[PDB]
Design a protein around this ligand. Structure first.
Ligand code: PQQ
Ligand code: PQQ
Ligand code: CA
Ligand code: CA
Lengths: 69, 571, 571, 69
């Protein structure tokens, strides 16, 4: 694996000798929990909502309040 | 905005952390020069009342200076006419637990300024705009969630009516993104992620049209197995640059997560990528991945320096950057064309070289990392041959003065699960001095480079890594702070040390300069910390602790202790 | 011992915190003078890596300097040939709970030296002797028990083969005593209590033979009701003086406990007493109680200054001292005769005057304190018109340059029980500036005095209390640090300010001086704290908090923030 | 109470007008607990013993150890 054998432009990864092409099902399977994987997105969704409310409240009231609800 | 432009065009002001939109971190102030620098003395000083690493440097707007501390991220405003009076101050209330999810000390790289406001963030993820004269909070919004391991450390960057802000946390699997906010209201405009769908990464319709071989569409997911990109890193916590004419801002996305390369097969795009994005829409015009499938934590967030220089006699709009991987890159900043990709030190062995035609590193398997194997004598180490330091450029001699690290390592990864809010590293390291220091113990260098060829002009060795960076002033001086506590000034011609002052503690930020009432001043933060100082700061002694930094810097505490403040010098 | 004497007789050395055995805190070094002080600049600096109040000053033995921090009481040894290298260091491991029983910030007033050893204590009560060259611990013993509210803050004092050390804690009912230890082994030689039986107090057979009206035997219990003396205070946490020829050491015992005067009827001897004790046996030759039955917390621990001057033409061996009560005392140090007892400022109203014949203060009932009554506009306040500052004496003009406080108060006591380990104060206060400041807002003064008459020669006002003290150097300069962060130098003839430098944080110690390679250096600790800075240091806002100091010093945090270090200056 | 009326040399205290000569049995009685009052002495006794042991061991062994048993 010297990075010079590309299956497609910009995709040149190769498994090293003795390692799998795909880790799913192998002894290197990370077995990630989808629930954990999606936590960042869920947090951002809720956070964006809180900020939107702050922005809207400041616009309508004329004063900015962080704890608005 | 127009106000920031006004300050940028004000002689002696310092409204941008990197020295200007092009981030050349230099100054035309020449009162202090090679002939009289020996007479420079301390003018005054200011303690922040906080310990831990004090990165960045203060801002100077008009006759006012703004100083910032490490977590809890305090801001202090001073009128230069009386440094003894704190005009206003902002002391955030943050949960102590915020520190638990910060990988590399509770550092803060600085404040920004725009529309008559000081733009500041907090480690806990808040971004605020405070009136520059009164300190009144105009807006305060959430940018990062510490509960999932996301925090704020980099300096915000202001361009037009936009504030760019990126979260930190790749060591905790945080998916990186540059977030854009309205300078006046704090409203979220958009965010460009480093991994995932092209829509989420915000790629222009003609993304990389000038270099299709760099890769174009669908790679944010195709170069990963399954949903691994969701916790794929790529955080940008370094520095930005901006070209007003092209309306493009530039920055580098960080390392992929976890550190265990075997757990994430694929090029892992678009982590460790140099970007050229439209400021208004965030759409990437071009993107160059420096380190496909990272195996060494070469977080690609280092400074982007824009310059206009002749390449083989032809004037060209350039972008230069020295990555953690030890390669000095120079690209055409308009289209992303790769012009230079040279090793900053011959010790670099992860790559035999970077192929200018294929655009990728020619990897040397002997120095790769992988499961069930301990790689040895790998250079650079994860701390890189260059880290968060801000370097300087002299427009006359056309030279970049780089603050480098000369540290290599041993590395072995291991399997671990991902749990939002918990660290997600997966590797054990041993770090030590590189092989080329005069006594094989030196870990720092100030090395001058021609950015059009990538060739060095001179070198000055330092016992410890040159972590903070360098500042260049027209008097022909290269200023920089050392981890052992000195502020130094070198002759830019040969690196000869012309002046030095023993500050209270090591400095991990880059010096700044400004003028006030007819006099040029040099300012430097002091207070050792950051990754190099974790051993000293957190009372660690295990050589492998601190991601392996403890062993490498075990002698630092015999030269300095913690601190937190600013020291100003002048004639 | 002999080794200490060698250092004392070494030009340019500084082996004793108070400047010498007589504690005149001065120096014959005259390189820096009135004509060239304007050219003094910072030489170098050193951060301790600790915050909170940094009292005292470093020691210089030969070509080595020893720096100390606030709790956890770290010691740093530096060779002056290279201040960047920490030759050796001692960083104690102490329970954080120790800070909970410290009344007035976690301060440390300094190190001592003797028999080639650095004598250092820790707030948790340990006293150690470390080899001055290697830092090796030769002995470590317990002196105070924090579990009963007893801690260590004062500097140890070495005389011959003895180390004098006194515990702090009167605010917690700690019964004071001067403990004496063997300089070589740390073995307890004896301890002289401030209250109780004559045997425990250690009174010579001829105690006060020259002044029987001062009181003699049995008063350690007779001037108390029942066993109240067992928790009667009298701790000595200030400074000492020693006369080798007379073999007498001098010091003042502290305030009686509790602050509630109604809970302890009686003169409360021997608290608030100036002592003359034999160094080898600890037996008191004489003892003068300055404030019988304290009602204002005028802890009588202030500096003792020994001088030899003509009193109305007759040469006399003197002891001078400015107490918290606002009275400047000058006594014959051989026999205790009272010679001078003058108010350092006319605002003092607790006493109409001190009667030289009866030897006691003529109390003014209008400004006394007592249960079920709120005393108002009482001067001095509990912080005193003079606190822990170390003043200087110019042997040529025969002048003492005193760092004074100009603060008064309102006070009302309240009943409370005693429980070992818990605070035992019993009073609520309000403090504010005295009535004589130029704008009636000033709280500090540098006032020059003739010790044989008690009359002032000149006054320089300061916004905040002159807490640290002053240093006098032969070039005709009075050096001192301010709570707002400046190191200053005044013309000793008229008090005119000739030089100043803005240090990182306020200074609460007294400046020191030494010579290295023939060059004169001035050293000052920085890092605000102590009683004046409790509001800033502990985030207090209630004006009555900090024993009433918070309100009085509410503006201090608008001029300075915490810090911890040393700054050195020279030509 | 001006401090100038002494019942004996060095003992000039006087109760202020309206206050008791002795507080025991009065509304100002501190009612201190005897055992509690003796805590400092008891602590010093134990402390002195620990130091004595350290000093003795150092003299016989030639090396100083703070924690000896
Ligand atoms: O992946 C990330 O998000 C992240 C964040 C940070 C940071 O924000 O401090 C560092 C790093 N990585 C790490 O790669 C690194 O080398 C580093 C050094 C420092 C420092 O300030 O000394 N921070 C960080
Ligand atoms: O009664 C005592 O034992 C005791 C101890 C201390 C100390 O050791 O810090 C202070 C005081 N009292 C208190 O009276 C006082 O004014 C004071 C000021 C300070 C200081 O360092 O600023 N300590 C102390
Ligand atoms: Ca990283
Ligand atoms: Ca007291």
């Amino acid at each position: 694996y010297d990075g010079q054998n590309c299956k497609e432009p910009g995709n040149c990864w190769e498994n090293k000798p003795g390692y799998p092409e795909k880790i799913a099902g192998s002894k290197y399977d990370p077995k990630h929990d989808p629930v954990e994987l999606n936590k960042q997105e869920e947090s951002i969704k809720a956070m964006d909502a809180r900020n939107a409310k702050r922005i809207a409240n400041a616009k309508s009231s004329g004063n900015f309040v962080f704890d608005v609800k | 905005d127009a106000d920031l432009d006004k300050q940028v065009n004000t002689a002696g002001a310092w409204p941008i952390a990197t020295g200007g939109y092009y981030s050349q971190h230099n100054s035309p102030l020449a009162q202090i020069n090679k002939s009289n620098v020996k007479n420079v003395k301390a003018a005054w000083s200011f303690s922040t009342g906080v310990l831990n690493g004090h990165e960045g440097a203060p801002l100077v707007i008009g006759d006012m200076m703004y100083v910032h501390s490490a977590f809890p991220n305090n801001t202090y405003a001073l009128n230069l006419n009386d440094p003894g009076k704190i005009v206003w101050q902002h002391k955030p209330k943050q949960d102590a637990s915020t520190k638990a999810v910060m990988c590399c000390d509770v550092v803060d790289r600085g404040l920004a300024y725009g529309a008559g406001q000081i733009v500041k963030k907090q480690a806990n993820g808040h971004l605020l705009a405070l009136d520059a004269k009164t300190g009144k909070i105009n807006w305060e919004v959430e940018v990062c969630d510490p509960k999932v391991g996301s925090t704020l450390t980099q300096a915000p960057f202001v361009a037009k009516d936009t504030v760019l802000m990126g979260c930190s946390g790749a060591e905790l699997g945080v998916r990186g993104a540059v977030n854009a906010f309205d300078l006046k209201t704090g409203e979220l405009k958009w965010r460009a992620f480093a991994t995932g769908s092209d829509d989420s990464v915000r790629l222009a319709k003609d993304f990389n049209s000038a270099n299709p071989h760099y890769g174009q569409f669908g790679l944010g997911t195709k170069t990963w197995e399954g949903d691994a990109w969701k916790i794929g890193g790529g955080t940008n916590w370094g520095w930005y640059a901006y070209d007003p004419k092209l309306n493009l801002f530039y920055y580098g996305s960080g390392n992929p997560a976890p550190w265990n390369e075997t757990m994430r097969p694929g090029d892992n795009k678009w982590t460790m990528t140099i970007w050229g994005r439209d400021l208004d829409t965030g759409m990437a015009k071009w993107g160059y991945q420096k380190t496909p499938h990272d195996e060494w934590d070469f977080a690609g967030v280092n400074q982007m320096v824009l310059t206009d220089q002749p390449v083989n006699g032809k004037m060209t709009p350039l972008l230069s950057h020295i990555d953690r991987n030890g390669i000095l890159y120079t690209l055409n900043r308009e289209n992303g064309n790769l012009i230079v990709a040279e090793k900053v030190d011959p010790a670099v062995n992860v790559f035999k070289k970077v192929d200018l035609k294929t655009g990728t590193p020619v990897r040397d398997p002997e120095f790769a990392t992988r499961m069930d194997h301990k790689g040895t004598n790998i250079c650079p180490s994860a701390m890189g041959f260059h880290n968060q330091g801000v370097d300087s450029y002299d427009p006359e001699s056309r030279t970049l003065y780089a603050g480098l690290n000369h540290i290599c390592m041993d590395w072995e990864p291991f399997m671990l699960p991902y749990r939002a809010g918990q660290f997600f590293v997966g590797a054990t390291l041993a770090m030590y001095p590189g092989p080329n220091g005069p006594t094989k113990k030196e870990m720092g260098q100030i090395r001058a480079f021609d950015l059009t060829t990538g060739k060095a002009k001179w070198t000055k060795w330092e016992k410890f890594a040159a972590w903070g960076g360098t500042l260049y002033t027209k008097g022909g001086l290269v200023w920089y702070a050392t981890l052992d506590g000195y502020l130094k000034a070198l002759d830019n011609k040969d690196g000869k040390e012309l002046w030095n002052f023993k500050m209270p503690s090591g400095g991990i930020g880059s010096p700044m300069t400004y003028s006030f009432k007819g006099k040029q001043y040099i300012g430097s933060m002091y207070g050792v910390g950051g990754w190099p100082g974790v051993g000293l700061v957190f009372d660690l002694t295990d050589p492998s602790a601190g991601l392996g930094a403890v062993g490498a810097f075990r002698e630092l505490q015999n030269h300095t202790q913690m601190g937190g403040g600013l020291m100003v010098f002048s004639l």
